[PDB]
């Protein structure tokens, strides 16, 4: 069977709801939809966005009300989900959903933005290491893995419009970029670059200064799989023209 997964950093679920989310979700018909930055308390949500016909949903909020948070809709439920790495400084921020879909684990992860402070940058780089430990433990078990979400780092100079102007900015720091290399040489494939080696391919633009209109963006959202799984990947693409957030969606087709 062809399995379609979408990943979208919605930056406000009730915000994207006011900008055509449910209409879009209906016409896209993914098998699994992974959502980052819900910024909403799940039980205090219009029941029509928690309930979508054909889908089971799973919300993982931050303990801080209206901050961060992730979610997952799926036609087939997972056998269960894990909501953390087992390090509670990493597990209280609404950033982790690890769903067990038999053939594979799906990591739906909202990786921390390290721009606000030197401590948040430290948290981000530490978050990255807990994640790597976690994913390696599981594929070393024999588990196949799919990881999508807001990684919050552009990997190579090709992954943003202004590489040289951003070398001392979180999102393109040589240390953040090197972890992606480290993540990659640990046996994981950036699935987008399996099929598309072109520039101009971004998933995030700043709302201001007509950034989207001028394609001044960063490729911050990713689909990774473990090397052994990559022959199952049919498509890895970007939904550049879907509006409603400062991020666009990305897709994966697996067989």
UniProtKB/Swiss-Prot annotation:
<dbReference type="GO" id="GO:0046872">
    <property type="term" value="F:metal ion binding"/>
</dbReference>
<feature type="binding site">
    <location>
        <position position="150"/>
    </location>
    <ligand>
        <name>Mg(2+) 2</name>
    </ligand>
</feature>
<keyword id="KW-0456">Lyase</keyword>
<dbReference type="GO" id="GO:0003677">
    <property type="term" value="F:DNA binding"/>
</dbReference>
<feature type="binding site">
    <location>
        <position position="247"/>
    </location>
    <ligand>
        <name>Mg(2+) 2</name>
    </ligand>
</feature>
<dbReference type="GO" id="GO:0008311">
    <property type="term" value="F:double-stranded DNA 3'-5' DNA exonuclease activity"/>
</dbReference>
<keyword id="KW-0227">DNA damage</keyword>
<protein>
    <recommendedName>
        <fullName>DNA uridine endonuclease</fullName>
        <ecNumber>4.2.99.18</ecNumber>
        <ecNumber>3.1.11.2</ecNumber>
    </recommendedName>
</protein>
<feature type="binding site">
    <location>
        <position position="152"/>
    </location>
    <ligand>
        <name>Mg(2+) 2</name>
    </ligand>
</feature>
<keyword id="KW-0479">Metal-binding</keyword>
<dbReference type="InterPro" id="IPR005135">
    <property type="entry name" value="Endo/exonuclease/phosphatase"/>
</dbReference>
<dbReference type="Pfam" id="PF03372">
    <property type="entry name" value="Exo_endo_phos"/>
</dbReference>
<feature type="active site" description="Proton donor/acceptor">
    <location>
        <position position="150"/>
    </location>
</feature>
<dbReference type="GO" id="GO:0004519">
    <property type="term" value="F:endonuclease activity"/>
</dbReference>
<feature type="binding site">
    <location>
        <position position="11"/>
    </location>
    <ligand>
        <name>Mg(2+) 1</name>
    </ligand>
</feature>
<comment type="similarity">
    <text>Belongs to the DNA repair enzymes AP/exoA family.</text>
</comment>
<dbReference type="InterPro" id="IPR036691">
    <property type="entry name" value="Endo/exonu/phosph_ase_sf"/>
</dbReference>
<dbReference type="GO" id="GO:0140078">
    <property type="term" value="F:class I DNA-(apurinic or apyrimidinic site) endonuclease activity"/>
</dbReference>
<dbReference type="GO" id="GO:0008081">
    <property type="term" value="F:phosphoric diester hydrolase activity"/>
</dbReference>
<dbReference type="GO" id="GO:0006284">
    <property type="term" value="P:base-excision repair"/>
</dbReference>
<keyword id="KW-0238">DNA-binding</keyword>
<keyword id="KW-0460">Magnesium</keyword>
<dbReference type="InterPro" id="IPR020847">
    <property type="entry name" value="AP_endonuclease_F1_BS"/>
</dbReference>
<dbReference type="InterPro" id="IPR004808">
    <property type="entry name" value="AP_endonuc_1"/>
</dbReference>
<comment type="function">
    <text>Involved in DNA uracil repair. Recognizes DNA uracil residues within double-stranded DNA and initiates DNA-U repair by endonucleotic incision on the 5'-side of the 2'-d-uridine residue, irrespective of the nature of the opposing nucleotide. In addition, acts as an apurinic/apyrimidinic (AP) endonuclease hydrolyzing the DNA phosphodiester backbone immediately at the 5'-side of AP sites, and as a 3'-5' exonuclease. Strongly binds to double-stranded DNA.</text>
</comment>
<keyword id="KW-0234">DNA repair</keyword>
<keyword id="KW-0378">Hydrolase</keyword>
<feature type="binding site">
    <location>
        <position position="37"/>
    </location>
    <ligand>
        <name>Mg(2+) 1</name>
    </ligand>
</feature>
């Amino acid at each position: 069977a062809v399995l379609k997964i979408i990943s979208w950093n919605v930056n406000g679920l009730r915000a994207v709801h006011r900008k055509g989310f449910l209409k879009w979700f209906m016409e896209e018909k993914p098998d699994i939809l992974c959502l980052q930055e819900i910024k909403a308390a799940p039980e205090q949500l219009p029941r029509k966005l928690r309930h979508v016909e054909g889908y089971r949903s799973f919300f993982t909020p931050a303990e801080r009300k209206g901050y961060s948070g992730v979610a997952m809709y799926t036609k087939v439920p997972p056998s269960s989900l894990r909501e953390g790495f087992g390090v509670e400084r990493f597990d209280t921020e609404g950033r982790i959903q690890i769903a067990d879909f038999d053939d594979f684990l799906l990591y739906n992860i909202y990786f921390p933005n390290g721009k606000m402070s030197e401590e948040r940058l430290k948290y981000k780089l530490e978050f990255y290491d807990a994640f790597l430990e976690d994913v390696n433990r599981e594929r070393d078990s024999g588990r196949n893995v799919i990881i999508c979400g807001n990684f919050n780092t552009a990997h190579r100079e090709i992954d943003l419009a202004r590489p040289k102007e951003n070398s001392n900015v979180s999102g393109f720091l040589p240390v953040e970029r090197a972890w992606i290399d480290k993540f990659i040489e640990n046996g994981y494939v950036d699935t987008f670059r399996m099929f598309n080696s072109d520039p101009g391919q971004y998933t995030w633009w700043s709302y201001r200064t007509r950034a989207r209109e001028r394609n001044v963006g960063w490729r911050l959202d990713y689909f990774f799989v473990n090397e052994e799984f990559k022959g199952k990947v049919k498509r890895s693409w970007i939904l550049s023209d879907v509006m409603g957030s400062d991020h666009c969606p990305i897709g994966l087709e697996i067989e």
